Design a protein around this nucleic acid. Structure first.
Lengths: 81, 84
DNA sequence: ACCGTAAACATGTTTACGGT
DNA sequence: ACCGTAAACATGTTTACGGT
């Protein structure tokens, strides 16, 4: 596929969430459900490595501790960045 | 071979030894290597893979240890004691 | 310089097992 | 029941490289 970039797909996923925040697990399902090229890829390697790479690298994504036991962090858009 | 103290006991004494009563996982490794003689000669990630895995397992298994988001660039979380 | 892809490496989380 | 040990899997963080 082409279209937008990995950093743009994560942003479009976050903007659709009511609380303006999504865990890494939630981003995976949104990509499978919203992007047709990932529709058959709901099973950790490849494009899932690229998503984690983009979240830690780009300053426009911040990591927020989750208020749920055993749950991964919240990923939201950086206000300043 | 370090005594009758458990891993949770060793992690607790390390955390209690800090002024802020909180340490990162990397710092817990340093106290074990620096304070416990049995761990003094196993600082490299070859002889350490064993006990370093046991420490992360103890921090995540027992409710006594809690995780707090760090306040740095990409620093790992703080590990403190559960108020319970 | 940016992006996608790959890989090493660190940090957390659970599940399982044998010994005391 | 508790502990130590080992291991699978997930989640985060860096570094490198070819192509545009």
């Amino acid at each position: 596929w082409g279209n937008l970039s990995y950093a743009d797909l994560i942003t479009k996923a976050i903007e659709s969430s009511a609380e303006k925040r999504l865990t890494l697990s939630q981003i995976y399902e949104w990509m499978v459900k919203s992007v047709p090229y990932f529709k058959d890829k709901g099973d950790s390697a490849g494009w899932k490595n690229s998503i984690r790479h983009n979240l830690s690298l780009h300053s426009k994504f911040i990591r927020v501790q989750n208020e749920g036991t055993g749950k991964s962090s919240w990923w939201m858009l950086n206000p300043e960045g």
